[PDB]
Design a binder for these strands. Sequence first.
DNA 1: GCAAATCGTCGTGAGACAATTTCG
DNA 2: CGAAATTGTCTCACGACGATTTGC
Lengths: 152, 152
Amino acid sequence: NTKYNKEFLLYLAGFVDGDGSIIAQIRPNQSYKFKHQLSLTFQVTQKTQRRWFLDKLVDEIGVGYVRDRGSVSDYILSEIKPLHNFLTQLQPFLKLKQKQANLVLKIIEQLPSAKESPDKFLEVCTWVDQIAALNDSKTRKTTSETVRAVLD
Amino acid sequence: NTKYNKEFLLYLAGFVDGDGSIIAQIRPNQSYKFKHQLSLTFQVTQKTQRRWFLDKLVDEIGVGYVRDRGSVSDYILSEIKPLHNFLTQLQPFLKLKQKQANLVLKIIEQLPSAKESPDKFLEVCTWVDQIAALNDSKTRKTTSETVRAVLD
DNA sequence: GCAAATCGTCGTGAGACAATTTCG
DNA sequence: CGAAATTGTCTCACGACGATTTGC
Ligand SMILES: [Ca+2]
Ligand SMILES: [Ca+2]
C-alpha cells in the first residue's frame, strides 16, 4: 500500500502509454477449478542496453522484477494486491490505457465472487475480452468464448 | 513563447521517452552555404488509429502538425524557434532523451555562428553525431565526417 | 487450487533517419 | 540561401500474448 509521488506517476503514466502494456489473460490450466487461471500483468518493455531504467522502476515502484529476453528486457508486475495499489494511483493520469487499467482493477476487485460461480467467472472473462480489444491484440487465443467451452 | 503546464510536460516527457524521438540530421543540399542543411526534429509516432492523440498534441503544443504514413502517424515539429521554447521546458523531465534534448538546444543556439564559419558549422555537425549515437541510430549516412569532406 | 513465476514468440508500432521539393 | 515541408522506408524495439512450471 505504498504511496507514490504525483510527479513520478505523471511521468510514468506517459511512459507506460508509450512503451507500457496492461495485460489480462485467460490461461488454460487443468489444476484450476474452471480449467483456467486469470492473470493480470503490468509491464514495461525496453531495449536491454537501457535495462537500468527498468531496474530503477523496481526500486521506485517497490515490487515486481526485470526479466531478460535477448535484445529487450521487461519490467514485470504480476502480484495482484500490489498491482491493484499501483494502477489505482496511476490510472488517473493514463490516456491510452486508462480503461484497460480500470478494467484490470474491476477484475481484481471481483476475483473472489468469480471463483464461486461459473457465471461470475465467465462475466469476468468478458472483462479480459475488452482489455485485449483495447490493446493492439494480434496473437490472442484463449478468450471468454473458449472458457464458454467449460459447459460440462 | 507559449507557457506549458508542468503536469502536461511531466506526462509528455514520459510519453516522449517512450514513443518519441529527438532527431538531428545533416542533409546534403547544394543550395546551402556549406552544401548541407542542419535539420532538427521533435516527433511522436503512433498507430494511425490512435492519431487523435497526436492531433491532440498539435492543439496542446500550439505548433507543428500530424502526417500519416500508412498504419502509422507522426506528430512533427521542426520549427526552430518553437522547438527551442518547447524543448527548454520539457527537458528537465526527460530521463531517456534529456541529453539529445539539450544537444538540440545547444545546436539551435549556435546556429547563427555556425553560419559564418565552416569550422563552427563543422563543430556543430559533431553535435549531431552525438545525438545520433545517443539514439538507436540504424540507417544514418551523412555525418560530420562526410561533411568535413567539404574541405576540398 | 490458486497466485506468481519461467521462458518464449508473433507481428508489428514504432523510432530514426534519407532523398528531394517548396517558397518567402 | 535557407527554414520547413513532403514522401519514403529500413530495422528494429517493442507491445501483447501463449505454454508450462513452481510453490504454498
Ligand atoms: Ca507505444
Ligand atoms: Ca520506446
